[model samples]
Structure formats: C-alpha cells, structure tokens
Target: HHHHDSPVLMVYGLDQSKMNCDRVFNVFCLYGNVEKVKFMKSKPGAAMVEMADGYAVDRAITHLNNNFMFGQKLNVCVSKQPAIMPGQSYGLEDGSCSYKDFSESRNNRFSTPEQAAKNRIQHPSNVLHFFNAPLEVTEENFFEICDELGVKRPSSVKVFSRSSSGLLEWESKSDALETLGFLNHYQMKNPNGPYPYTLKLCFSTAQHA
Candidate 1:
C-alpha cells in the first residue's frame, strides 16, 4: 500500500490556477499510484507528487519530465532527500567537509536530483529586466532573494553595478509572470534604517543577443 514515506516527485511549469490538480493527479496516476499532490507555497508554479517508491519516481521521470501538459512543457524529477525537520542531521552526505563555511559549501555543492532533471528541460524565450537595485547587491544576493521569493534561479543574472540594474531570464513566460507577481513589491530591510527599499520589476523583451 502507498504511504506518506513514499519518494516525492517535484514537478514544474504549473503556474496556472485554472489547471486542475485532480487532472494532473489523474494523469500521473496513469503511471503509478500517486499518494498525494500538493502545490508548493513558495513556488506555486510547481507541485509535489508523492509516489509509492523510488521505482515509481524513476518510471514517472522517464515518461513525464519533458512531456507537455496543458499546452506548457512539464518538468518532473526525483526530489532531494528530505532534510531533518528540526534538530536532526538527516544524514545528508557531508560535501562541505572540504570548504571553510558549511553553508556556502552546501549551497555550492548541493544539486537536488530534481534540479538536475529540470536542467534538461527545454528553454523558453521569456526574459525580464530588473532595475533600481541597490548598488551594493551582488550576484549571490540577487540569486538568494530570487530563490527566497520562490522564483526559479535565473539562467543568468547579469548585474550592471554602474547602472544599479540587472537582468533575469526565465525558462518560460509563466515562470516570468509568477516571479513578477510575487516579487514586484518585495522590500528589503536595511539593517541600519527605519524603512525598507522596494524592488521594481517589469517584463522586457529586449536583451543582448
């Protein structure tokens, strides 16, 4: 019998609210017994589908990752091992042993299996331009903020420090819209100040070819 301990399947390109979860569940169930389907709060553009086991996840990835769904391409892959809920280490392999900082090392070395699968997904033409950023912001900070907002990491983040501006490219138009809707009015608190600075976001078709 399928249970909660089943391996979770992470899916992307699901931003449309009009798209029914039941429909997706039914579609995936055609491959295996789907235990649960949940949308990510941080990344509403994606969903997590739990299956009976790792074998089921493997089968689904083989048949569905790049398959088209609701007119948009789908990205399906096996999720990362779940981290410890609170205090436990969850036995994640210590890839950071060679680095000076555990946090930096983990971020630099860790690639969730799902991310690797998504990398193989086809690219889209949508691109965006972000302006009016604080001059001190670095590429790491920019990517960090984007990740926090549940925006998929940009294919490229080119910051023009001299102009205090940057550009972000998404794999699809839906991804671009989701990022803009969630981050347009996002404010970053200044550690030493009373008010926060709001980020300006907009769609831009123009980009350096």
Candidate 2:
C-alpha cells in the first residue's frame, strides 16, 4: 500500500445498496480524525473521506483498504482531488454525503479506556449526560431535543448501546452547563405514546458508570 501525505481518499467498490457517507465515517473514523465525508452522486457507491492529518490518512490506508463491509471489499485509494470544501448544504441530501470537523473530537482508535479505580476519573465533568431515556432513544433524539429547546448543537453526541443513556460534549463547558438547564428532566415520548422518558441530565463523565 502506498502510504504518504494525503488528506483525501476515495472509497469506491462498496456495497452500493447499503453504503453511504455516515457508514464510511463510522468505519474510517476508527482509523483517524475524519474531517469530512462526501458521498458522490454522479458515481454511485463512491465517496470521499478527508482526515485531519497525513498520519491518520496513512493509518486509514493501512487498515481499511480492501476491507470488506456488508460483504463488499471497499476499494480505498488516495484521491487526486484536494481537500473537500464545505458547500452550501450537508448531510445525505448533499450528494448523499455527510460532513464534520473532527479535529476537536476526542474519540479515536488509540484512546484506550482506563479504569477509574473508582478514583482517578469517573467521567468527564465537562460532558453532559442524559439518561432514563426509552429504548428507542438514539443520538438523533438528542439533536431533536436540542432543536426544540433552542440549545445549540453540541461538539459531539455519543449514543450508548442501551439507547437509554448518552453523552453530549461541547467545545465550551458553559454550553454544556447551559444545556443542562432545560434538557434535564425533559420528557421524551415514544411514537406509540405513554413513553414518559423523563431525561436526567448532569455534568457527568460516563454514560453508565
């Protein structure tokens, strides 16, 4: 594999039926700091990921090239195109694409989890924790709640397996603290109704522990 300084890479030969910008980011972010992911419209089943660093790009090459997902071997190659430029629109509708500025993200392959020993650190004090949500809750619910409450988007949103607990992080601790004002104890009802999911919010560091 040719590993060099390249911020952009083309991912083609994917399972077109299931592939999209979100899935690409989900996998590629496992290797590095993904800045943006743009799925191509003209070229179906094709997309591009722009990482923050050359080393990250190199790592993605070493790990994801020819990697199979959804029973398809993804063809990951360095693209001739320069870094992707932000456009007027984003998300699936934008050429079926997705974008983000992951440079500020703390999630990465190398962030080994360490024990609190019930001491050193239990959770991130700056992180806002929401819990007691219904089983159907997801990160999208967090966004929707923020939208209705007039809370600015957070720096990041992490959804746990239970879909009952989640973490929302922001660049500024104040934002998270401010979000706590109304987000906490908010009721989220399921479409089926009677799903009084009374959210519990706090400046927590962990979702469960």
Candidate 3:
C-alpha cells in the first residue's frame, strides 16, 4: 500500500491504446516492485505509477526516463499530486469513462463478470479456429506465421498433427480479431516451392482455458 505522499511518478509519452498495467508492470518491475499504475483520465497517454519506496522510484526514473517503449519515448517525473486511489474519478466533462482504460478498472478486458455493473466491455474471445494447417506446422512455424502478420504472439498455442489444425489464444480480443482478419487468407509461402497454402482463421467460441 502507498502512503498519502507516496513516491508516485507520472509517466508520459505512452500509447495508452495498448499500454495496460500488466504491460507497465512488466517494464517497471525490471527496476523495482510497482504498487500501482493508474492511467490519467483527463489526459490520454499519461499515467501515474507507485513504487514500493523512493529508492525504487528513483531507480525507475533514472533508468526509464526518455526510454523508448511501444514506439514512444517515456517521460518519468516525480508527481506533484498524491498517490492515486483506484476507482477515484477525475470528474471530467463526461465522468462515466474516466477509469475505463486502466487495467485495474472494471471495464478492462480481464475484469470478471461481477465487475460489469457500471460497464461491461465485451471483449471478443481470444480463441481462433485453425483449419487446413500443414502437419509440419509446429508451434515454431505457427509463431512465425503470427510474427509475419505483426500481431501479438499468442498466450498459448496448441497444434494438432493428425487433425491438421491448431488452437491459439491471444492476450486480448483485439489481437485475435486482427489475426482473424489478416491471416484468414494469408499465404504461407514455403521455401522449397512446396504446398504454399493459405492460412484459415476464424474467431472461436471455445474458451482458452
């Protein structure tokens, strides 16, 4: 837990569209433990993050300031405002969507069913149906296909040899949608002039678990 005057810092120049708390934690945790990451409601691409102590804050700022992440240069600075509490409002012109973008909020993709009273963001299922995959299409090849499509690598990938099929789960619904759109007719060109086949993708109703 953070104090009233906690060592909170404001992070700038982020791509909030894809920059959720888990991604922020993955970056900041390299320097020290992060207590919280709260994206600014009034301003896009700005966030407040709290470390365990001043030392951690200093370390994060020293190392990450002006750092390039998600194709944006970070600007880490000590905040004049106190540590942000979860569910607090910015009282904007429209107060409804204030905390929706932050990963901790109920509108987040990972939010549970109980958190959906105020807003229930229906994220598309992460599962994608695989059809006509070559028997040689192992996990590595599947990853290469995704890489070629410039999509988020799946959280879990399962390839079936006998069925010539596979199932994969992306971290978010958007990635699954993107993959479904782009890779639906993607041609997997082979090197030896072999069975250069096109990939088939569709959003699956099945759960990733």
Candidate 4:
C-alpha cells in the first residue's frame, strides 16, 4: 500500500440516508482536526474532507478505508485537491448544510500536544476505548445510541469510576470497527457547557471489557 500525505481526502460510497457534514466530522475527527466537510451534489454519496495535517489524513485512511457504515462500505483515499474550498452547496438528506466548517470546533481531540497524547492509535480490535463523554453516561445510553446508529451494541461496557473513560467489548472485531466509523466523536448535549461534549473513541489494545 502506498502512503499518501495529503490533508484532503475524497470519501466515496457514503450512505446518503445517514451521512451528512456533521456525521462526516463526527467520524473523521477521531484521527485529527477536521477543518471542512463538503458534499459533492453532482456526485451523490461522495464528499471531500480537509484535515489539519497529513498525518491525520493518513491515520483516517489507514483505519477507515473500505469500512462499512449504514450498510454501505466506505472508500477513503487522499484527494488530489490540496485543500477544500467553499464550492456550491446544497442540503443533504438530513436537511443539514452540505458544507460545514469545523476548524474552530472544540470537539477536535488533537488540537494540542497534551490532547494529542491522549489518543491511542491501533488497528481495529474487538475492544474500543472511549472518553470525553458526559460523566453520568451509562451502558443503557450507549446501547440506545448503538440502536440509533443501526450498529450492534457492545456485549459489555466498563466505565472507570474516577473518569469518563471506559472500554466496550463487542463479539467481533468487524462489529467494533463498524461502530467506530459511525459513533466516534459523537456529540452529546452537556448540562455543564454551552457546547456539547464530544465522545472520543479509538481502537483499544485491551483484550477485554
């Protein structure tokens, strides 16, 4: 496989029923900062995403290419375009703006050195590590989200008593991988802040929940 060092990516085969700018940002921000997301109205189910750096693009492509989401398999690849521009825009299936700017969003996990250090990058595994969720969030809440996303709920959920971080175990690696593509960086309304708390997820080295 060739390693491409472009910050912009061309993603294809997105499920139009479940995909949008916000959803794209939710999934890609797990690997790096998302600057912009734009859908190609002319080419349905295709999008262009700009990340903060090439490394983020590389990680996203490495982990997400050919992954399944919303019953559709994704194809993530480096775009020939150097960056994303505000081109023609339209409404997506979800009625949200087709283009969104997330450069200033606080949900980006790799915005700082300390923040970047917290991420654990690994190939897809049966267990996933999650953090930055609302402190009182529980297993039932996760199960509900899994149902909403149309992915299998984890077989078990383990939360740390002292922190919002935790582990979730699925019956198979493919299940966890599919969940990550749809759920990572999902935002939940926070009673504490004006902005929502974005749930962060990554493949875990842990063998169990």
Candidate 5:
C-alpha cells in the first residue's frame, strides 16, 4: 500500500466550555481543509480532527502543538483513527453538536489548488499577517479581541484598510503563537451586515509589523 495513512489528529486540552465543533474547524482549517471535527464525550477536553491530507495534519501539529488557549496548553498529535464518525454524538457545553462535517465549508483556505498556493506555511513568529477582517477594522478592535480572549495584545498593529488586512506584532514569538491559537479565525462584529466577518491570521513573511 502507498504511504496514505490517516490524516486524523487527536487534540487534547481544549477548554471544553469554550471550544465547539465550529471553533475547532476555525483553527484546523488554517493549516488545511477540515473534513470533520468530533469531541470525545468519554475524554473530556479532547477531540479528533480529520484534515484533507496528511501534510495538513503535519503542518497543524507543527504550528499548534503546545499553544495556549483559554488558559490551557494544547496537545496535538496524530490519531490512530482513520477518520471521525458521527457515532453516538452529543451536545457540547456551547449547545453545538459534538460531531461536525466541514467538507464543503467555503471557509477552508486550502480547498483549491490556487488557494493552497496562496498559503504561507512559515513557522510561528512574532509578526502575524491578518486578513478578512471588517473593512473598518482598527487597532483598538484587535486590542479588544485580545483582551476578551484573555491573550496579550500585540505590541503594534498596522492596518491596510484598502485590503482589509493588517500586520500584528507581538513582543515575543511565544505570545504570537498563543494569540494565534485563539485569535485566528475570530468572528468580528459587522456593522452593515448580519453576518460577522471572520478574521484570518498567518505568520507574516515580513520581519516586523
């Protein structure tokens, strides 16, 4: 057989009170297309995430392992399970379903060849490139988000309003990594529309914000 092992990952130490299937998709989809996410009822603070490919799983583990979110450090590693099933699903504390299928989500960044090519797979750094935020986004909004998420605020934020994107610089790489765990794919208030805008984040190629 070929080297096509399972692309599933076992994630531990989630803040079960705050993390739901959609939020899990939000984080995992940054590295790859998330096919499914399932929280284990028997294993508190644990979940199984199935990415579109093994490489995506590798990237996720490389970037997200040991990252802090909601006062807990995540433990990300490959899962022996081939895939996630809806078997015996239940409700989360957030009232969302335990198992979710995201195979057709438009928010998947690596769903197509062109999209995949646009991804910057750099290692965690102090400078984070942020996009898909509200057009009227401001540095204060980012600070507010950091405060709400209980993460440290960036040292500086440079917004490119024309592109609805910006660069955020933290005092340390560890700080950026922790923020990315919580800030990436955060939903922001959209004044003009009923739908909230999703903030996207990645490691910036630039040395500084």
Candidate 6:
C-alpha cells in the first residue's frame, strides 16, 4: 500500500532501453531507500524515481539532482500536476473520446484481448529475480555489462528496498537463456568503492497464479 505524493520529480534523459531499474535504484539508494523506480515504457528517455518520503527526495535533489551520468546531464525537477485523473479523459483534437474510451479503441487495434492484457502487464511475472544487490551500481553499469555480453532489458523490473531484493522478468525464454549463458557468476563492483559486495544472479520461474 505505498502511496505517491504530489510534486514528484522526474529524471530526464535516461536511456530506458539500455538502463535497468535495479541499477538506477542502486545509485539513488545512496540518498535513501527508493520506494520505486520506473523506466518509462512508452517514453524512451526518462524515468520516475520515487523515494520513501519527501525528505529523502529533497536530499536527492540537493546532491544528485542536475548531476551527470553516462555523459548526459540529468534534468531533475518537480513534475507538472496531472490535468486529468487516472484512467480519465482529456479532450483531443481528433473528435473526442475519454482517455478510457481512447484506450479501449487503441487496445482494439491489437490482435486480441489477450495481447492487450499482456501489454497491461507492465512487469512480467516470469523469469529470474535478483536480490540483495549492492547500493552503488548505476544505469550505465548495467547497460555496459549487458552490452558486453549482449543482454537485453527485462520484460519488467521491481526494486523493493535498499538492502532488499527485487525481480527482473524477461520477455523471451531465449533472452533468459542468453542471460544465464553469460551473466551467471559475473563480478560487479562499485566503481567508487572498496565495498565488498559483488553481483550474484540466479534463475527462477513464475509461481502458480
């Protein structure tokens, strides 16, 4: 039951296709435990990083805001207030329907309801889950590692705690197999540290629904 407060900050210029949520969480966790970190699916170059409280967010803004990562100068600021409620509609130039109506119509364009259902499943429940990650990895770190061995983004990602574990769901069965082929026993370390933690990965499957 984690609720988000208003005036949330958005981090821009993030490379979602190459960056992993866990790695972003690891960098932000230094300021405080992140409540959630999401890489936008529809949008390619941005992310939403939510912290446990406003105070932690303030701290993050103080230190890490407007900083550089992966040679990109980050844009950090308060997000604009939403013009409409969740799942609600805003008028559009193209003759008009509610957001829900627009959504339904757009979804109909897909092959089947199952395909639509699958699209709504933001984070897949299948594939490997990584846990107890160190708090120093950055988005670049993840992309570099994956690129070296040609790994792709997970179907979905969930990072729960600073010292806690999270899930990484792969879209294709072969993607998971490819990851296992190269990333198992991979050694990851904080570039800025003498921290003793190393990357540890494992394979898992979705539990019965």
Candidate No. with top TM-score = 4
TM for every model, in the order presented, reads: 0.38, 0.46, 0.44, 0.82, 0.81, 0.38
Candidate 3: Cα lDDT at 28: 57
Model 2 agreement with the true structure over 59-173: per-residue lDDT tens digits: 6677557544444566778877758865554445434545555545443333333411211212124477666778877667778888887776776887677337777887655
What lDDT tens digits, residue by residue, belong to model 6 across residues 1-209? 44344424567865434445444553444444355454544545665665545655665566556555445566665445312233433333233231221222221212345542432211212365554465654445555777786677665655544433455566665465345434544566544556635454444545411
Q: CA shift at 37, candidate 5, in angstroms?
A: 0.7
lDDT of each: 0.53, 0.61, 0.60, 0.84, 0.85, 0.48
**Candidate 5 local Cα displacement, residue 133, angstroms:** 2.8
Q: Write the per-residue lDDT of candidate 4 for residues 1-209, one digit (tens) a residue.
A: 67555799999988887778877886787778899999988989999999999889889899889777656788999998868888877888888899999999877878899989977667668899998888788999899999998889999999888228899999887688668767887778787777787787878889999
In the range 1-209, model 1's lDDT, one tens digit per residue, is 43334367788876454333443443454344455565534555576666656766776787666755346677887777432122211211222111111122221111446533422222223566665566676668767987785567776777764225677776766566445545554566555556665555545655631
Candidate 5 per-residue C-alpha lDDT over 95-189 given as tens digits, one digit per residue, 9 for 90 to 100 = 88999998888778897899999987876678999988888888998999899888899999999742389899998876886677678778888
In model 6, which regions exceed 4 Å deviation? 1-7, 80-209
Clashing pairs in 1: none
Off by over 4 Å in 4: 1-5, 134-136, 148-151, 185-197
Tell me the lDDT of model 3 at 37. Answer: 76
lDDT of 4: 0.84
Q: Which ten residues in a row have the lowest lDDT in candidate 5?
A: 1-10
Residue 159, candidate 1: C-alpha displacement in angstroms: 1.3
Instruction: Supply candidate 6's per-residue lDDT for 200.
Output: 44
Please report how far candidate 4 places residue 21 from its true position, in Å.
1.4
- Of 4 and 6, the candidate ahead on lDDT is 4
